[PDB]
Amino acid sequence: SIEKIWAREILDSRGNPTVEVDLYTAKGLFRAAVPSGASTGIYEALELRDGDKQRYLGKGVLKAVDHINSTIAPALISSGLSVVEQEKLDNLMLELDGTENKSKFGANAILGVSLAVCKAGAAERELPLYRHIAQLAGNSDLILPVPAFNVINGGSHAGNKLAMQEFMILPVGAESFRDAMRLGAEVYHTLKGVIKDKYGKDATNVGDEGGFAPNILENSEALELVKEAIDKAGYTEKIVIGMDVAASEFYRDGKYDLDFKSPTDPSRYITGDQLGALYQDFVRDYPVVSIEDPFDQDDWAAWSKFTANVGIQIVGDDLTVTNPKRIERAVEEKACNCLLLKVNQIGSVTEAIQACKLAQENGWGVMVSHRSGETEDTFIADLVVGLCTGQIKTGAPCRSERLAKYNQLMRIEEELGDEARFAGHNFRNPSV
C-alpha cells in the first residue's frame, strides 16, 4: 500500500511551474514530474493552471498540487490498493475526477500520481521500471528505439519564421542505441557549423528542444541544411529525416498559411492538396521517412488522402492525442499509420498503455514522445523500451531535459547486456 503522497510545484525546462509527486512505500521514495506542451492539440486532456495573472504569469500549478495533496492522496491511501495495481489505481483516480477530460483535478494532477505509482510498482515487483511497464503491457521482449532528434526547431513559438515545427534526424543505420547517440551528436555539432558558415554565429543559438532556428522561411531550406550536415558528418547511408509539421498551428479558415509567424495576411494561404503536393516533393527530394501532423487535427479528409498516396510513416499527434476514442476513428478512416504517444495528452499510465496497444493491434507504429516543456524526469525512456515501440523523440542532443532521457536509454541498453536489440531499420515495425 501507499504510505504517503506529497505533491509540489517544480519548474520545467522553459521556467514554468509543473507538478511533481513524491510517493512513499515500504520500499521508499518514488518521484515523478509532468511535462507541458506548447503546440497543444485542442483535444488533449486538461492541463490545470491557476491563472493568477500576478503569479508566474498565470502558470502556477498550485491547484493541481492541492487536488493531489488534499483529495487524491487520502483516497488512494485509504483504498489500501498495492502500487503494482496500476490499472486499479489509475481508474480510481479517473472516477474521483468524474470528468471525461480530467478537468476536475487536471490531467497534470492525475498523471503525476500515475507516474509515481508506476515507479513504486516496479520496486514492489523488484524489477526495473522498463520491465514492470513491459509486464503491464503484456510484452515478453524489449527493444531499444531509434531516437529522433529535433535539430532544426521551428513553428508557432519559434525563435524564427519557419512554419513547420520540427526537422529530426533518425540514425536508423546505427549499430546500437549508444552508437545512435554518437551519430546524432556528431551530426548536431556538424550542423552547428554549417549554420554558422552560412548564417553567421547569431544563428547558432538554441530553441526550446535544443535545436537551431536559423532565420529562414522555406522548409525545404531546413531539409537542405539537415541533409548537408548528415553528409558532411559522413553518415548519408545511416541517417534519415523525420518532420513534425504541427499543421494545426497554422490552420487558417479551412486552409494553411506557411507564414502565420509573420503579421497576418490571408493571401499567403494554401489548400490541403497544395500542402500534400509539397510533402510529396520533400519525400522525393530528401530522405524524409516520417511526417507528423501533416494536416490539422480536424481535417480528416486530408489525412486519409495523403496517407493512401504515400509509403512513408504518417504520425498522428494532435489528431490522436493519445486517446483511444480518437485513435479508433483514425484507424477506421485510415488517417495515419503511427501514433505519437504522450502520457500527458491523456493523463494516466494505464490509458497511454491502452492507446499504445490499440495502435499496435491495428498495424500502427508508435513513437513515444516528450513535450516541448520537459523536466529532469526520465519515465519515457523506460516506457519506450517497456512498450517495445522502436522509436522515440525526446529532443536535440542538447539541454539535459532531453539528454536525461537519452542517457537513461543508454543505461537501459547497457543494462540489458547481451539481451539488447536495437530497432534500427525496423523502427516502424520492430516486432520482427
Next chain:
Amino acid sequence: SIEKIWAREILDSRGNPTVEVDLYTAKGLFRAAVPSGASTGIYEALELRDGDKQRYLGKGVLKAVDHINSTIAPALISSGLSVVEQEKLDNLMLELDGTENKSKFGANAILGVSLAVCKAGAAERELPLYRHIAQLAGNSDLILPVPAFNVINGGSHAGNKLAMQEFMILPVGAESFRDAMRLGAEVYHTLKGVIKDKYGKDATNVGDEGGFAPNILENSEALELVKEAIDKAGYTEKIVIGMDVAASEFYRDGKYDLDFKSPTDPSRYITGDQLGALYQDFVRDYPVVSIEDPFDQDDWAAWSKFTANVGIQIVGDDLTVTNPKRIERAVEEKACNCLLLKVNQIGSVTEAIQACKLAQENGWGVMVSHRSGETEDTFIADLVVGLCTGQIKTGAPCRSERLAKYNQLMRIEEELGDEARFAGHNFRNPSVL
C-alpha cells in the same frame, strides 16, 4: 565498504561526452556525473579527453572511464574503507594519480568517483546529502543560498557579439528560496518580452546556460535589458545584478577585446584601465553588486587595483580555479573577495571543501557554481547548502541541467522546514543569521 564501481560515458547539456560513475554498497546504487567548462582557465585540473577524431570530434571520455573501472575501482575496494570516509578515499585517488593537476587519470575520472563516494557516504550515515556534506565541512546551521540566474548569455556561451559572458539576477529580497525561484522566473519571462519587443523574436533563442542570446554587442545594453525586466516585473527593490565577464576569454596580447567573436581587429582593443573604468560606469549606472573574472587569470595587479577601488563583491574564477595555492596568492594580494567554487576545477570533493573553508576563513564570500556543460546531476544543490555559502549560480531558470539544481534546492528547503533560513541580503556573509 565499496562493493563495485562502474563508470560510463553519458552526454552533457551541450551533447558532449562526460563521465558518469555508479558506485555500489550494501545500501544500493549511487550515481554521479561530471560537468565540463567551455571558458576553462589555464590552471584548472586536467579534463582528460580521448582525442580520437573518429569519435565525438575528439571529445570522448573512454580513457577516463577505463581509469576508473580498471584502476581506481579495485584500489578503493581493496582499501576496505567505509564510503563515509570521504577524505581518506579522495586521498587514495590523489596519491594514486600522483600528479599535481590530475593529469594521469584526469580530474574528471577522480571527481566522478569522489561524488559517488560522497552520495554513498551520506546514505551510509542515513542522512540527506546536504547534511552529510555539512558534517564533512564542520557546519551545523545550514542555509539556503540566494540563486544567481544567468538570464543573458554572451562570450563563449552564446552566438552573438556580446563579449562578456554572464548577466545575472540575484533575488536578495526574496522571502525564501521557493520565493527567489518565483522572482527569478518572472523576471526571466518578462525579459523574453522586452527582448522580443526591441530586437525581434529571433533574438530570444538561448545560450549554453539558458539565458537569452540577443544579437547585441554592448555589454551596457545587456545590463539595460536586465534592469528594465527587473523594473517591469515589479521587483526593483528586491533583485540586484551580478556579472561574469570571463575576461581571460578575450585577453589579447596584453589588452582586452570586447568584440572578440568578430574577425580579429586589434585597433579595437582596450587596456586593463579602460576596462576597469567601464566596470565603474556599470556599478554607478546599474545595481551591479558582484563581478566575476574582471581581468585575465594572470593579470594580478589589475585585479588588486580594481578590488581596492570598489565596495562590491569581486569573484575569482579562472583567477583562483578552486585551488588552495592560487587562493592563498589571491588572499595575500587582495585580488578578490569571493571564491567561485567548482568541484571539477580541482577534481575532488575533499579539495573543493578545503578550498571553500580557506576562502571563508579569510573573510571571503563563496559562490557555488555549475559549469557551461552540465548534466542531470544535482550534487551542487546539496553542496551549497551543506557548505552554508549563501550563494549559487547554476543557470538561467531554463534548460533542466539548470532547473534540476534549482528544483533540488526547493526540495531541500521543504525538508528543512521551519529550520530553513535564506541568505537574502547576507549572501556574501550568511554566518550572521
